[PDB]
Amino acid sequence: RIAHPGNHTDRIPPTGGSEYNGTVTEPWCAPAAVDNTYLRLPLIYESTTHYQQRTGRYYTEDQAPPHGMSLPPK
Amino acid sequence: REAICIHIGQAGCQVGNACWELFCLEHGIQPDGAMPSDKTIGVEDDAFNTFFSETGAGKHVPRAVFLDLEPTVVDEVRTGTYRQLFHPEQLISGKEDAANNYARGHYTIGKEIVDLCLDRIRKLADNCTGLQGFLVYHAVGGGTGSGLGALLLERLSVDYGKKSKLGYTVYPSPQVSTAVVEPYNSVLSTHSLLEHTDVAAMLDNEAIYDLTRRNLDIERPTYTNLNRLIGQVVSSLTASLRFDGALNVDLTEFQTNLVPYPRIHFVLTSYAPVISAEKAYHEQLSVSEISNAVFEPASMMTKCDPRHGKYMACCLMYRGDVVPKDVNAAVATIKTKRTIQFVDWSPTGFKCGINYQPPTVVPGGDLAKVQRAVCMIANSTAIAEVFARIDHKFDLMYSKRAFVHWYVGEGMEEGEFSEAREDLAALEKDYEEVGAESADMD
Amino acid sequence: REAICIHIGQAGCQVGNACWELFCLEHGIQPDGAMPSDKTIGVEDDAFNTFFSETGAGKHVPRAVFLDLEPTVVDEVRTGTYRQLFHPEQLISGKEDAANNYARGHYTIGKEIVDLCLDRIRKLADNCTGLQGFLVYHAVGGGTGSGLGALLLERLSVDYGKKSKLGYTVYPSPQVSTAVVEPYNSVLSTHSLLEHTDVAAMLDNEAIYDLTRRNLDIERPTYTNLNRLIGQVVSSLTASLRFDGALNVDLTEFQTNLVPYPRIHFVLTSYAPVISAEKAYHEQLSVSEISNAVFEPASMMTKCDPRHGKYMACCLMYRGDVVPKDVNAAVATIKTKRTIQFVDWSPTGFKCGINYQPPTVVPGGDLAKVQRAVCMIANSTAIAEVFARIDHKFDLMYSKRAFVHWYVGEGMEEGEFSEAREDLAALEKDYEEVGAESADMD
Amino acid sequence: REIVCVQAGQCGNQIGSKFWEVISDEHGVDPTGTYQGDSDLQLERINVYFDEATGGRYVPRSVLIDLEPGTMDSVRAGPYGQIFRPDNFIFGQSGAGNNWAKGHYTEGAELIDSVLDVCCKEAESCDCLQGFQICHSLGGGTGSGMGTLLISKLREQYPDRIMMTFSIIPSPKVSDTVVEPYNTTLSVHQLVENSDESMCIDNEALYDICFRTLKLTTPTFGDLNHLVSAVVSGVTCCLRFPGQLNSDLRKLAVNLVPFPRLHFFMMGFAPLTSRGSQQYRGLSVPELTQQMFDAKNMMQAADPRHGRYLTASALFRGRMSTKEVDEQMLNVQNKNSSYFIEWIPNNIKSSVCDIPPKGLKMAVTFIGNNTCIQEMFRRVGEQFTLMFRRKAFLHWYTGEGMDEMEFTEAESNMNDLVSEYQQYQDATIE
Amino acid sequence: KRKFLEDRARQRDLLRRRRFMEVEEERRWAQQDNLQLRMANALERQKE
Amino acid sequence: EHDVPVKYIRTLDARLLPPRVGHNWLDAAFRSVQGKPQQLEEEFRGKRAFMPPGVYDHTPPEGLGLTARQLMQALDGRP
Amino acid sequence: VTALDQESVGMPAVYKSRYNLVEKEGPVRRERTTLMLERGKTVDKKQLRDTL
Amino acid sequence: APPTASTFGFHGTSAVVANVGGENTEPSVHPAKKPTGTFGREASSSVNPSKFLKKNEGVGTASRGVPIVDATKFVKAE
Numbered sequence A: 001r002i003a004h005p006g007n008h009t010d011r012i013p014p015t016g017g018s019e020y021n022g023t024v025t026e027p028w029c030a031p032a033a034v035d036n037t038y039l040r041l042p043l044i045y046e047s048t049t050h051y052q053q054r055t056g057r058y059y060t061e062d063q064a065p066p067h068g069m070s071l072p073p074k
Numbered sequence B, C: 001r002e003a004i005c006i007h008i009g010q011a012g013c014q015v016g017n018a019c020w021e022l023f024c025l026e027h028g029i030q031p032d033g034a035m036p037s038d039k040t041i042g043v044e045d046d047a048f049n050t051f052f053s054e055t056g057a058g059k060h061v062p063r064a065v066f067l068d069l070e071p072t073v074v075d076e077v078r079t080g081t082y083r084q085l086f087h088p089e090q091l092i093s094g095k096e097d098a099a100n101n102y103a104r105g106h107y108t109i110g111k112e113i114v115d116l117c118l119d120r121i122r123k124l125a126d127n128c129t130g131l132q133g134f135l136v137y138h139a140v141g142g143g144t145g146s147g148l149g150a151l152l153l154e155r156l157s158v159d160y161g162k163k164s165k166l167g168y169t170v171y172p173s174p175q176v177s178t179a180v181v182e183p184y185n186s187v188l189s190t191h192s193l194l195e196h197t198d199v200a201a202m203l204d205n206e207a208i209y210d211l212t213r214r215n216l217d218i219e220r221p222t223y224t225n226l227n228r229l230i231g232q233v234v235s236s237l238t239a240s241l242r243f244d245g246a247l248n249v250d251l252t253e254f255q256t257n258l259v260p261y262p263r264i265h266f267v268l269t270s271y272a273p274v275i276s277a278e279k280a281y282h283e284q285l286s287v288s289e290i291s292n293a294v295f296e297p298a299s300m301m302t303k304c305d306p307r308h309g310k311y312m313a314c315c316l317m318y319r320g321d322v323v324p325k326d327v328n329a330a331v332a333t334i335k336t337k338r339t340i341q342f343v344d345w346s347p348t349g350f351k352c353g354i355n356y357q358p359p360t361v362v363p364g365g366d367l368a369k370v371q372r373a374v375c376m377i378a379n380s381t382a383i384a385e386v387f388a389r390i391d392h393k394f395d396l397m398y399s400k401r402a403f404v405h406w407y408v409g410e411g412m413e414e415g416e417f418s419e420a421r422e423d424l425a426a427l428e429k430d431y432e433e434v435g436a437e438s439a440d441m442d
Numbered sequence D: 001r002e003i004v005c006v007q008a009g010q011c012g013n014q015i016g017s018k019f020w021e022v023i024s025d026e027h028g029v030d031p032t033g034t035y036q037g038d039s040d041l042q043l044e045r046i047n048v049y050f051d052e053a054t055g056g057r058y059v060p061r062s063v064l065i066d067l068e069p070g071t072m073d074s075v076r077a078g079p080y081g082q083i084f085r086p087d088n089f090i091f092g093q094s095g096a097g098n099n100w101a102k103g104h105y106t107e108g109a110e111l112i113d114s115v116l117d118v119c120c121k122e123a124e125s126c127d128c129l130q131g132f133q134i135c136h137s138l139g140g141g142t143g144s145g146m147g148t149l150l151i152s153k154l155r156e157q158y159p160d161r162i163m164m165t166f167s168i169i170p171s172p173k174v175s176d177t178v179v180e181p182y183n184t185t186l187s188v189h190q191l192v193e194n195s196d197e198s199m200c201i202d203n204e205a206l207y208d209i210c211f212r213t214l215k216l217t218t219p220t221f222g223d224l225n226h227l228v229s230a231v232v233s234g235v236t237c238c239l240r241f242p243g244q245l246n247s248d249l250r251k252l253a254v255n256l257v258p259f260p261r262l263h264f265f266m267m268g269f270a271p272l273t274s275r276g277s278q279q280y281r282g283l284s285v286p287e288l289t290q291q292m293f294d295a296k297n298m299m300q301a302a303d304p305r306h307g308r309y310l311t312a313s314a315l316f317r318g319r320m321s322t323k324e325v326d327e328q329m330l331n332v333q334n335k336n337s338s339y340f341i342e343w344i345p346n347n348i349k350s351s352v353c354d355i356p357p358k359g360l361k362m363a364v365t366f367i368g369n370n371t372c373i374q375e376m377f378r379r380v381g382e383q384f385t386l387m388f389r390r391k392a393f394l395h396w397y398t399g400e401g402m403d404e405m406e407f408t409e410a411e412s413n414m415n416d417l418v419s420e421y422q423q424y425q426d427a428t429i430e
Numbered sequence E: 001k002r003k004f005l006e007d008r009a010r011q012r013d014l015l016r017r018r019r020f021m022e023v024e025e026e027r028r029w030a031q032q033d034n035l036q037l038r039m040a041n042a043l044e045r046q047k048e
Numbered sequence F: 001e002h003d004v005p006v007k008y009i010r011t012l013d014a015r016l017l018p019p020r021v022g023h024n025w026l027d028a029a030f031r032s033v034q035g036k037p038q039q040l041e042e043e044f045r046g047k048r049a050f051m052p053p054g055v056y057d058h059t060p061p062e063g064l065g066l067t068a069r070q071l072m073q074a075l076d077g078r079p
Numbered sequence G: 001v002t003a004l005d006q007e008s009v010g011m012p013a014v015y016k017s018r019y020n021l022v023e024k025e026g027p028v029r030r031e032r033t034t035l036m037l038e039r040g041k042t043v044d045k046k047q048l049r050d051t052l
Numbered sequence H: 001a002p003p004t005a006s007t008f009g010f011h012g013t014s015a016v017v018a019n020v021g022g023e024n025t026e027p028s029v030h031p032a033k034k035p036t037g038t039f040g041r042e043a044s045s046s047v048n049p050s051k052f053l054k055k056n057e058g059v060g061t062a063s064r065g066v067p068i069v070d071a072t073k074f075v076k077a078e
Ligand SMILES: Nc1nc2c(ncn2[C@@H]2O[C@H](COP(=O)(O)OP(=O)(O)OP(=O)(O)O)[C@@H](O)[C@H]2O)c(=O)[nH]1
Pocket: B008, B009, B010, B011, B012, B014, B015, B069, B070, B097, B098, B099, B100, B101, B139, B141, B142, B143, B144, B145, B146, B170, B178, B205, B223, B226, B227
């Protein structure tokens, strides 16, 4: 029902955890490089093990502290 | 009381990340090494001591080394979230890999790195007062894991002597494969694992993938799921040291009960309540149900069928809310089955352990929360089929000397292939002979 | 009670600057020589007396001379921050250097300056009531340090007689090098240090560089770091004279316990908690850990490995909050080790000292602040390997008479090269013979 | 772990300009040379290809060699040209004339000392040196002659490192140069003795990729050199970014080369599809594997159906499951079992890297060691024998000074290479 | 037992939420592709 | 607020797309001027050169304690 | 080295020399000894039994 | 005997800390000391068309199948 809402009256309300920029606490900001405007930068640039280290102690990924795009996480 | 963990190469370090996340979360140590200053439970219990030591500043730090020949994985550990937990000396990294050559690891490259490893192990063993073994995690399919793991186990075995060495080993899956040269490395590895380990637990990634598809509801698993399962198994085996219980089991009791003859030390491992949160509400999960679960071959973490062999000894570890009478009733029910067979020279087939601390639940985890669990390690003649497929693949490849020039260039005599293949053949014949009925008295 | 320090040449004056910085900051004497009225030291106290004397108005002045042939370094001291601390007579400077020639320093140039040095040293020794030795800092690689240090030690040994002379010497590093003629100066130097010193401590700059890169986290070390480490070591050794403790150790006890035969006086030195502030807070620092540290060859301040020889005597100085049970347990653990070996004629291998004053920390990022430390001086046959590399470099150069005309022109017979090389060869044979097991009873 | 690049001749310098554009983009280096990236993950491995100049700037560790500066004069005035170090441009005063002997013996020996001096200057600065990387064509003149000269000198000087080449090879249908068989035969003789691993690309296959697969209306050499730069930057991706299963040039060589003469490889890159079709098919690991073995996406004229695979390698970039990769590689091996050499139990190695190329969710590059490469060498040997029996253009090479005996040695060595491939193709278990 | 039941309930709810979020995420990946496709088509038309 | 604003969607600009095969709007073979430069010879003769500016940042560290500030500050005969 | 106990105005908290130790550990040890001597003279068996 | 646990004199190799064990060995498998380094050799004089490269006469390296490590004074692990 989320994938194909169609014309149904009983639509599923959004969860509020997914955002295009990847952060639920910070608004969109213009990137330093012009060609990176359309990319989802906070999601592309993160290793898998770092992701499971940061997100491991939370039942849900939006409760985790923001990535921060820093070599040691903020 | 204490145990020291040695993590080698990529699989061993990645499994280490899952293990130490779990052990921190189970004891309650924060990722920065400091316990919550406002958490006054009332009695500061000693249970951490099996895995942590204090820095005198009151930080906890763990009894582990991380060993790699390439920098990337250890630098990833150095820059992650747990930066402050580890002592920086514990994270040892070389410059360049062993390039899938056992010969390069053993002769050329590991010989440079091995003395730093020995100095760290020396510094750990000096900060103990009842050390009772080493736990080692590595894969035998890759070059540095095989070559440096063997070299390091040899050096440990000369220096420490009688101290126990327990290995968790990632073996080549029977048809899933990741590299071409896996048979050579596994053959050359098995001589060292035969001589220089007290119990060896065998793992195949294909079995844990099947288990995560079948039991859990995960369509696209990745290594973090497997590593969390392995961490749960290790926590179950070491729980007997750390928490109150009815029947404790020290690692020497494990070694005494599980190993009948000094060469017959390769064991199968399985874990019962692998279950999703949605499945957990349709079923009760009593002692007898999970005891019945550990004996089904669908539960095993190694791709072998135990119905094709005979059990010699089983060690069953129960943790959580279990009562000994229920364990006895379950074991009595297992004994009746006809598709479970013990060698006639092993009448008293079971060892039990019972611990009160239930398994911990990890926030991002995929396992459900459950009141009780059981973990089994068992020794069985079925393992002989496992060796046979490597020997056939080695014979197929070695008949044309398909890659040998790499090994000879990196320092190995061609003769060493045939020696190792004959030694593994004799081990196969030992497992054939032990399972032969005693028809001598007729 | 009192000790006088003599600093010769460039390394010896710069290390003296670092030492007196440290001794001032530990006692609390202001760089003007006064003492602020807000401190709780008390006017009556005497601990300074080992190193300072008062004129009666309460200014402090130190028991030291600085000797150099070039003006620049002493003029740097004269124009620096401690200008008002030193008496101007103490800072003695010639016009021009000994140009890396031992012969020029000993025969031509030092002979003019040496009588002034003896008149100032006499003026110091007349203002004492319990002088108990000379501490000498010099490098044997350069011309004035070798030549004037030897000449001055000869004159001191005639004039003062029985008074003890303990040397700290910067020897030519085994592969780091600064000048071509280092082997000649070091060979010619060792004869005088052999005859005219009671205990000789050996230092190598390559070892202190290794220690500051490996143990400390310093990417770009400079001589001030090395000199601060040396100052800490001297402060540790002289702390036993200056503060209360459980087991005191007088400077005569070092020579009595450490020296078995009158020629066997070359000793290895090491210091335990050389550690950075970030590592120090990652690790506990009990007595037994730092005692284990002083025996690793990675801890040494001389580039030698003691595993290639046998110990004859060890003297262990503990300062700070230490309890005798930890010293006894540590020494018994060291005795247990299999890679640590003592000659069979030295059964009681250890001397202990225990002082309550913890080591002082000098502002900057070269040592953590710690409540306790241990310092070791030890006599071992392994030192013969250190001399052998200089002899090989000497033989290489002397095979072609590569530079000898300079030395012969400045006043030295060619015979002196062969004499010195044979005397150091005899010192190696002494270390070979002393280390030979007593197989005479068979 | 630092790589040194060498770009030789017209083809090499042109491909190099696009390669260094792609690499500078991936690490977020502005065309002024200033770092302007947006994550530390970009910065933390910049050393692999760049040296650091003062206040921000990065400079690329590459040597450019050509006999006439025209291509180099164009790239320098090009949009990224400023990044290159001025001292790294080496040029002569007369052209190679598309003649191997001229390029190897007369202007080669004249210039070569300055190239070796620059390569040594660059090599000794690294804390640990990985293999050299060279891009050149085999059919040309300065590319073939000076590339193989430099390769021989570097193999004398650095025998313990890895030697890697990317090489352009003559199309089966139309020649770009009349004397291609001589230059190709002599260069393959040099490579087969000296090289550790060599990749071959046909321009005809890139033209067919552009026209058939991408349906480009007006393709240009910038597109072909972008395809090459894409595969080249993909093979090295695991060296310079984190991942779940790291890989390395030496591990690729160890898994790909069964015997030391068999080091010539086929290349492919999978996610190619026209903008009109792209709306009709989402990216997924099955889709990548199907495209990866799809001949539309393969960069050589020879077809696998006439040979057998000894070994293959796949490098995946992106966040993806390892299970799907493993079962796809098993399924392809099981369904097409006759095209895989049966006395090796598993021919495919996989590797997984976290960081995809910009603007693609996932990508894979494919390297294949297949016996159908023998048909190319056989064709070149035929054309060589046709020209040599009649002395068709031989006076140029003999006038430079070559002995005719050199030609018979190179022909014999190629014929033995073809025989060795044919023998291993038809081997059996018995 | 009651506390264990409450913990199991909250865990199941949070897992359901996460399962919703992944399906929410895939469409944003699709949008990221769509923007580039549109701009490329417009530029091609201008060149023609 | 988290989505890309419409100022970057409703324009026609070729710099927003990363380089790739098929992105050939801004390259050679389409320029109005196709003359070949003689930059190298002129550069080696020393009458033209490139020298881009650099970047330097002069921010002071934050959160320093009293002792650190004192350490930073550290570095006539009349009665 | 700072003092274990706070509210200590003495900057050299640990400067235990001969003179400091005699002039500081004389009075305190003597006071403890005399307190022990006089305070233990009045023994009360009943109060000790009550505490037990 | 070479110095033990040193940080000088093995630049360009794969070693991190050289010779911790204190045995008679080279610091690393790759040559720490070589005939020529950054100075280079003469290559113009050494190339002639009359001494051309012959069949199976390439440079012998570890990838070809020649144990280069046995020719140096580096102790292998027994
Ligand atoms: N379960 C599990 N298996 C892994 C993991 N990492 C690698 N493997 C498996 O182990 C084998 C590869 O061994 P590696 O650890 O990569 O070898 P290595 O230790 O890195 O040796 P080198 O390649 O020489 O550096 C393959 O079968 C992989 O599937 C992991 O994190 N978890």
